[PDB]
Amino acid sequence: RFLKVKNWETDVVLTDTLHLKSTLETGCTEHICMGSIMLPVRTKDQLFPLAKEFLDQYYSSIKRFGSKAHMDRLEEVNKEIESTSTYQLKDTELIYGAKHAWRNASRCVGRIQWSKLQVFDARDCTTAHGMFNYICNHVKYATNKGNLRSAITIFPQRTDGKHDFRVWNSQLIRYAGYKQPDGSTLGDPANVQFTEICIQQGWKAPRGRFDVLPLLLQANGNDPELFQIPPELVLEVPIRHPKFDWFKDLGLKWYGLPAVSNMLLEIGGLEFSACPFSGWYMGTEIGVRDYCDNSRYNILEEVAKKMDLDMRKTSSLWKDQALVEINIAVLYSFQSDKVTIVDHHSATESFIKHMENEYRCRGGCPADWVWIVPPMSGSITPVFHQEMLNYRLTPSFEYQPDPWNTHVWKG
Amino acid sequence: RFLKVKNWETDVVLTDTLHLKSTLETGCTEHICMGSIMLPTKDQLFPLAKEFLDQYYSSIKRFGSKAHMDRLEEVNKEIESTSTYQLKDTELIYGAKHAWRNASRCVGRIQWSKLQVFDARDCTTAHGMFNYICNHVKYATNKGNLRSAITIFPQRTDGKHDFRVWNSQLIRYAGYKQPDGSTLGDPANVQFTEICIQQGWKAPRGRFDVLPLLLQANGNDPELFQIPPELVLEVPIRHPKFDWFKDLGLKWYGLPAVSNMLLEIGGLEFSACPFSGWYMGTEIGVRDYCDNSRYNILEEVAKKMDLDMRKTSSLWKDQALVEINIAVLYSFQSDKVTIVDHHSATESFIKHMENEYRCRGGCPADWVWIVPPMSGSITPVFHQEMLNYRLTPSFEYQPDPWNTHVW
Ligand code: HEM
Ligand code: HEM
Ligand SMILES: N=C(Nc1cccc(-c2cccc(NC(=N)c3cccs3)c2)c1)c1cccs1
Ligand SMILES: N=C(Nc1cccc(-c2cccc(NC(=N)c3cccs3)c2)c1)c1cccs1
Ligand SMILES: C[C@H](O)[C@H](O)[C@H]1CNc2nc(N)[nH]c(=O)c2N1
Ligand SMILES: C[C@H](O)[C@H](O)[C@H]1CNc2nc(N)[nH]c(=O)c2N1
Ligand SMILES: [Zn+2]
Questions:
Q1: What is d(CA A112, CA A354) in angstroms, rounded to the nearest whole number?
Q2: What gap in Å lies between CA A214 and CA A205, rounded to an integer?
């Protein structure tokens, strides 16, 4: 079966056939679309089909499908599953696996960059202290003094689900949040719950607006341990505006390295429960969501006040006006300090080109419109006008429950 | 079965049971989501009639009453004989209101029950249709104080005798491709603007030339009519701060009135059913003015603003876009023409969704269409999970008449 998507601005039509190699479910049916829903151990039994399908993809990509080397690898994985109830990926398979999970990430606008991903194999790690060391090297290599490079670090896979490696942090670098007894929050409201855990585990909190959280690291199913990232490794950017001199006096800064550490990497049925990956920021992630979400730093009010906007009625578009100024500020600050960043116009245009290229080379590009369209200025970016097909391919990144909800405390 | 939707900004969770009364299909399967795609007999008829009458008598608290059964019997006999049936006035009014209530792509549904229905089922000619349309326009415009309305022409019979309004909206501006090479007026209407000329319209050849109506009664060739200009309320666009703005020479019409959709009530198809309400500001300022394939004036406005257009990262398109939208809202409001801003409308829609969850057990909603085309995440709808599904009565798309009608 063939499927077409149309671009309503340019009238380009593309044909998707890749959706035919699609495994997992969407959440939708014939009678319901769950397109806007945010969230819609294995036996040998289910493991060998997933192993084989992965190895068939792998051996196609290297043009060795059906070769002696292909068949022996199959037989060897087969034996290893039936013998040990699991198996080990080679280096090369791991690398290809990790690239493809990224390539298959339908909610990622940054995928033009998928083939350049530094993969660090941390599958020999056994302790939290080891995890800390791998992460520090990740952060240093990725940061690269402002010239950001994509990378992922991959810790040992799940086995019985009782020995999991987890990074309790949702991102490697993120600011604390402290709910005050008057109901207001100091610092980032998103991170209040995690911050408390940290305090519980023995972190002495500076209790300021921009405190980098400590790493909370679980190895081999053990209780997690606190570690401070060395501040010399945390690249940060003070926020100023190119025309508004009072902007700096708002006291804002942000970190340069976005590094997501709570997702699950699935490759050939194996589950990598700690696989922090990092790239660089699209400006609107900071200036729209991080600063302007009502449930975040929410600075729209203060910025609007200082711009002396008419705030007495929403139809003045004072929110809209302040939001753009803040986003101009974020891009200006990052560029002036030479820290890699991409604006939403440039990021969405690159993605359109990637997507077409993917239809040509691969037969499709799965994509989630709800996520790919930027949280401001939607229709003046080319993605808004692009029809997109959403389906799940493996390898992939998946959500997993928060570890504090599932962890069995050894004490 | 029972499905939850969460608002991620407020944590509010709603349970949806209304989707289990879903009748039509979405485009999606277990394996592909088509959420972003723009366009995904006597036998057929009686179930359809029954399902609709069942909901009607239920809404008026008379489900399973003599009057209910008696009507079911009546429609059955008329179907058995005539191979169609006629709706009673009360059912017609109910069908139309509910078609609006069920429009998952419509952010303005808080108002769904305040809908004026004009029964035009006794119409027989394009001249008749013209008169009904002028009355609809005048009623709805109401000197700037806009009122929702729909006018319903006769239902399809054998699909040989169709009533259609060829215009996609009652009031749109003309589009002419110029010897130079580009486009004069509205590029969306270029092809239609030429079909009107190929039919005999004498175009004033300006930018904002209100198109002539092209009306088809009973499957006949369609006919041209000019809407009396005094019926077409327009707004000169100016900025509350930038005096040069008016120099661009922009105006827009006050009355949005969609005229190409098909209204489906109890299996009956009303292929001409123009309906109108009022604008959300972003429809003109973001889409009509700034879309690349529309009036595309962003570049022009940015210039007059002396913005740095050297690099996309100055967000000059974004800055301009906001001022344009401030100007639309300001002009309409100054002139006492009804308009709603995207902040207000989305807040209203959240309020509506909540009403429908408790009073009805859900509310079909298409997130891709409900989130405004600018400032998405600063409106409450952005953080709202929505379930999308198709209930009847409904509005549907239909092929463009000119690809179907035989001359
Ligand atoms: C290289 C620079 C990159 C840019 C500018 C970029 C951009 C983005 C943006 C803007 C989002 C939406 C985020 C949100 O709203 O929370 C996203 C989502 C995603 N990205 Fe990329 N990305 C980049 C690199 C990567 C890399 C290296 C990976 C993994 C190797 C990745 C995997 C994903 C995944 C899994 C999601 C979805 C998260 C979720 O479902 O919650 N991204 N990316
Ligand atoms: C009262 C003021 C109203 C406002 C502010 C409003 C707002 C909107 C908006 C912004 C859209 C998306 C339009 C687009 O991007 O093209 C929309 C779509 C829709 N509206 Fe409402 N609306 C209103 C009244 C009505 C009425 C009276 C009806 C019918 C009785 C209706 C039925 C629909 C339908 C069927 C669609 C989408 C059609 C499609 O699937 O393409 N609306 N409306
Ligand atoms: N808030 C969520 N996700 C979330 C929260 C915070 C950050 C991110 C995220 C994910 C991937 C990429 C990005 N942004 C980036 N530019 C990168 C991070 C790592 C490499 S690129 C952010 C995603 C949720 C998902 C499902 C329910 S909530
Ligand atoms: N853009 C489309 N349709 C379209 C074009 C122009 C206008 C509208 C539309 C529909 C309903 C409401 C509105 N806006 C309004 N405020 C109203 C119109 C009538 C009552 S309210 C616009 C819809 C398409 C759908 C599928 C392919 S193109
Ligand atoms: C491809 C995509 O679905 C298309 O551009 C949609 C997106 N969302 C929209 N939303 C509204 N309200 N109106 C539209 O015309 C569109 N266009
Ligand atoms: C309910 C809805 O799916 C949710 O708020 C989504 C909408 N689109 C998004 N898009 C991106 N990139 N990131 C997000 O967190 C969200 N949130
Ligand atoms: Zn879907």
A1: 5
A2: 10
Nearest to A315 among B35, B333, B386 (CB): B333
* SS3 label, residue A173: coil
Residues belonging to chain B: 407
Q: Which of A127, A336, A318 is nearest to A248 (CA)?
A: A336
Q: Report how far residue A176's alpha carbon sits from residue A190's, in angstroms, rounded to the nearest whole number.
A: 9
Ligand 7 ion local residues (Cβ < 5 A): A 28, 33, 35; B 28, 33, 35
Are B285 and B325 in contact, with CB atoms under 8 Å apart? yes
Testing the interface with B: which of A18, A25, A36 to mutate, by most B Cβ within 10 A? A36
Q: Which helix (H) or strand (E) segment is A287 a member of?
A: none
DSSP SS3 for B297: coil
In terms of Cα–Cα distance, which of B230, B203, B227, B232 is closest to B214? B227
Q: Between chains, do A391 and B32 touch, taking CB under 8 Å as contact?
A: yes
Tokens representing residue B210 in the block: 């209100």
Which residue ranges form the domains of chain B, and what is each CATH number?
16-121+148-158+262-276+346-370 (3.90.340.10), 122-147+162-233+397-401 (3.90.440.10), 234-256+279-344 (3.90.1230.10)
Distance separating alpha carbons of residues A380 and A373, to the nearest angstrom: 10
- Report the 10 Å Cβ neighbour count for A124: 9
Q: CA–CA distance from B374 to each of A131, B9, B80, B160 (Å)?
A: 42, 19, 52, 43
Give the dihedral sign, CA B139/B140/B141/B146: positive
Resolution (A): 2.2
Which helix (DSSP H) or strand (DSSP E) does residue A229 occupy? none
Query: Which of B324, B382, B286, B307 lies closest to A321 in space, CA to CA?
Result: B324
Grouping H, G, I as helix, E, B as strand and the rest as coil, residue B76 is helix
Alpha carbon distance A17, A21 (integer Å): 8
Residue nearest to atom 10 of ligand 4 (CA): B258
Burial code of A206-238, b = ≥16 C-beta within 10 A, e = fewer? eeebbbbbbbbbbbbbbebbbbebeeebbbebe
DSSP state letter for B244:
G
Length of chain A in residues, anyone? Answer: 411
- From the CA of A106, the nearest ligand is 1
Taking the C-alpha atoms of residue A60 and residue A383, their distance in angstroms, rounded to an integer, is 31
Is the peptide bond prior to B364 cis by the omega test (within 30 degrees of 0)? no
CA distance B2 to B257: 36
DSSP A6-59: EBTTT--EEEE-GGGG--S--S--SS-B-TT-S-----HHHHHHHHHHHHHHHH
Nearest to A291 by CA among A242, A244, A324: A324
Centre a 10 Å sphere on the Cβ of residue A135 and count the other Cβ atoms it contains: 27
> What is the Cα–Cα distance from B329 to B335, expressed in whole angstroms?
10
Say how many C-beta atoms besides its own lie within 10 A of residue A405's C-beta.
6
Torsion of Cα atoms, A184 then A190 then A195 then A196, to 10°: 60
Alpha helices in A104-191 (DSSP H): 128-143
- Helix and strand numbers, DSSP H then E, in chain A: 12, 18
A311 by DSSP, 3-state: which?
coil
Three-state SS string over B80-96 comes to: HHHCCCCCCHHHHHHHH
Q: 3-class DSSP state for residue B392?
A: coil
| Burial class of residue A395, CB neighbours in 10 A (0-12, 13-18, 19+) | buried
For CA atoms A157, A158, A163, A165, the dihedral sign is positive
Query: Omega of the bond prior to A395 within 30 degrees of 0, cis?
Result: yes
Alpha-carbon distance of B179 to B261, in angstroms, equals 34
Q: Which of A26, A315, A334, A338 to mutate to test the interface with B (most CBs of B within 10 A)?
A: A315
